[PDB]
UniProtKB/Swiss-Prot annotation:
Identification of the protein by name: Steroid C26-monooxygenase
Alphabetized InterPro entries for the sequence: Cyt_P450, Cyt_P450_B, Cyt_P450_sf
MF (Gene Ontology): cholest-4-en-3-one 26-monooxygenase activity; heme binding; iron ion binding; steroid hydroxylase activity
Phenotype caused by lack of the gene: Cells lacking this gene appear to metabolize cholesterol normally, probably due to the ability of Cyp142 to compensate for loss of Cyp125.
Function, in words: Involved in the utilization of cholesterol as the sole carbon and energy source by degrading the side chain during infection. Primarily catalyzes the sequential oxidation of the terminal methyl of cholest-4-en-3-one into (25S)-26-hydroxycholest-4-en-3-one (alcohol), (25S)-26-oxocholest-4-en-3-one (aldehyde), to finally yield the carboxylic acid (25S)-3-oxocholest-4-en-26-oate. Also able to sequentially oxidize cholesterol itself, not only cholest-4-en-3-one.
Annotated family: Belongs to the cytochrome P450 family.
Positions annotated to bind heme: C360
Source superkingdom: Bacteria
Reactions it catalyzes: cholest-4-en-3-one + 6 reduced [2Fe-2S]-[ferredoxin] + 3 O2 + 5 H(+) = (25S)-3-oxocholest-4-en-26-oate + 6 oxidized [2Fe-2S]-[ferredoxin] + 4 H2O; (25R)-3-oxocholest-4-en-26-ol + 2 reduced [2Fe-2S]-[ferredoxin] + O2 + 2 H(+) = (25R)-3-oxocholest-4-en-26-al + 2 oxidized [2Fe-2S]-[ferredoxin] + 2 H2O; (25R)-3-oxocholest-4-en-26-al + 2 reduced [2Fe-2S]-[ferredoxin] + O2 + H(+) = (25R)-3-oxocholest-4-en-26-oate + 2 oxidized [2Fe-2S]-[ferredoxin] + H2O; cholest-4-en-3-one + 2 reduced [2Fe-2S]-[ferredoxin] + O2 + 2 H(+) = (25S)-3-oxocholest-4-en-26-ol + 2 oxidized [2Fe-2S]-[ferredoxin] + H2O
Organism: Mycobacterium tuberculosis (strain ATCC 25618 / H37Rv)
The protein's annotated pathway: Steroid metabolism; cholesterol degradation
Induction remarks: By cholesterol.
Length: 411
């Protein structure tokens, strides 16, 4: 029996996500068609013109695709499953210059070098300064009495995480943050005038300038470890470091921001959990926040050969779209998936992707950013209560909140 969905329903349809998360639709697929052909009419495939894709809705299937990188390619069509319908193919393939959209062995070499910048020591060295700024962010917001939680609480700390990871001087962080903000949301009317391409170019130019300067003055930021050759001569060229900085500016910003915003939306909806958090400050909360937020609704892969997955024949060349939003609520993996439980432990969510070659390198940095900001929110604005409904972001694969008016004082 076919799944009870509207005819022509596209799970990457930005017009859906601008209003709601299609939670019931995902649940219907999990029950009636866990791997389902998502057809797309001509010119309505968000940049891809192959007629549709396989909607992947079960956690285990998401994990199987993520593990079998040899079959399910990121490079072939990139991992973002939706752009503007009119995007030029070359503007998709230019994104192959970032680690996210590479296959082995190119990806293998790159992740090995980049790993130097995300060692636990490198991230943990940001703990104290981010905790400081986190406390300052919440106190300044709380003093304002009320405002947009997205902008006064959620936005800054992720941007400062990136800046501190790269050693960007404070005088440059403004433009870094603007470049980062200019690379997501171009399908939402509020961001119709942003130019992700131009900001990428400028960012590359800034990053390459930074690489040659950090070569003359070996600091202790990751930049020196990345452009310094190891015993086998492996390092990032100046342009390779340019693309890595582009990768960081886009990845390190809005996903964590929307985790924070939707973490708090969850807390306002689940007072018992908010109360529990304020007393125990459990760090397991960060993972339940990411599972609940699933800031990346979906990433895609392209099959390099015929492959049978859970009884369905994936054909060579076809796209499979991993709906993390569905997998993170898989009744077969989670006890009470639709209960918000900040003590959930273990929490094998795929908010950071399925385990495999492309698993989020910023996972523990994002977790630390979330734990720090929610401790600060708990310290400074514990009686926060919302004022109006969040404004959702029009995107086909990102789960975003543009705005959320909250009373920080509590009334
Ligand atoms: C809550 C915040 C975040 C979420 C939800 C998230 C989500 C994801 C997901 C789902 C993947 C898997 C990609 C795939 O398998 O195709 C991924 C990979 C990646 N993440 Fe994140 N991420 C977050 C934070 C960050 C941060 C803070 C950084 C950098 C500071 C970062 C950098 C990356 C990179 C570079 C990759 C690609 C790694 C590779 O291809 O080897 N992410 N992320
Ligand atoms: C928003 O897309 C990107 O994140 C991206 C990724 C890789 C490369 C480029 C790029 C390279 C050269 N010129 C313009 C853009 C952009
Ligand atoms: C080419 O990449 C992107 O345009 C992009 C845009 C938004 C978010 C992310 C992201 C965030 C966290 N982890 C991995 C990727 C990437």
């Amino acid at each position: 029996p076919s799944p009870n969905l509207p005819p022509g329903f596209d799970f990457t349809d930005p017009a859906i996500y601008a209003e709601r998360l299609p939670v019931a639709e995902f649940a219907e697929l999990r029950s009636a068609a866990p791997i389902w052909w998502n057809g797309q009419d001509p010119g309505k495939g968000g940049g891809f013109h192959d007629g549709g894709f396989w909607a992947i809705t079960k956690l285990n299937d998401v994990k199987e695709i993520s593990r079998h990188s040899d079959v399910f390619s990121s490079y072939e069509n990139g991992v973002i499953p939706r752009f503007k319908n009119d995007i030029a193919r070359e503007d998709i393939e230019v994104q192959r210059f970032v680690m996210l959209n590479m296959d082995a062995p190119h990806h293998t070499r790159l992740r090995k070098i980049i790993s130097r910048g995300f060692t636990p020591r490198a991230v943990g060295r940001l703990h104290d300064e981010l905790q400081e700024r986190a406390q300052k962010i919440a106190a300044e917001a709380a003093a304002a009495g009320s405002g947009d939680f997205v902008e006064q609480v959620s936005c800054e700390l992720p941007l400062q995480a990136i800046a501190g990871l790269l050693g960007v001087p404070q005088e440059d962080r403004g433009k870094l943050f603007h470049w980062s903000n200019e690379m997501t949301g171009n399908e939402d009317p509020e961001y119709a005038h942003i130019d992700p391409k131009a900001s990428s170019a400028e960012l590359i130019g800034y990053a390459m300038k930074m690489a040659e300067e950090k070569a003359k003055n070996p600091a202790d930021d990751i930049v020196t470890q990345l452009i310094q050759a190891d015993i086998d001569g492996e390092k990032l060229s100046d342009d390779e470091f340019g693309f890595f900085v582009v990768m960081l500016a886009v990845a390190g910003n809005e996903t964590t921001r929307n985790s924070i915003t939707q973490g708090m939306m969850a807390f306002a909806e689940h007072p018992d959990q908010w109360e529990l958090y304020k007393k125990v400050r459990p760090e397991t909360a960060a993972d339940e926040i990411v599972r609940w937020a699933t800031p990346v609704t979906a990433f895609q892969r392209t099959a390099l050969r015929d492959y049978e997955l859970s009884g369905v024949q994936i054909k060579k060349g076809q796209r499979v779209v991993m709906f993390y939003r569905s997998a993170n609520f898989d009744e077969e993996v989670f006890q009470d998936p639709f209960t918000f439980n900040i003590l959930r432990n273990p929490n094998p969510h795929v908010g950071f992707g399925g385990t495999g070659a492309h698993y989020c390198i910023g996972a523990n940095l994002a977790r630390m950013t979330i734990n720090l900001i929610f401790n600060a929110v708990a310290d400074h604005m514990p009686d926060l209560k919302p004022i109006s409904a969040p404004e959702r972001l029009r995107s086909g694969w990102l789960n975003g909140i543009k705005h959320w008016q909250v009373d920080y004082t509590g009334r």
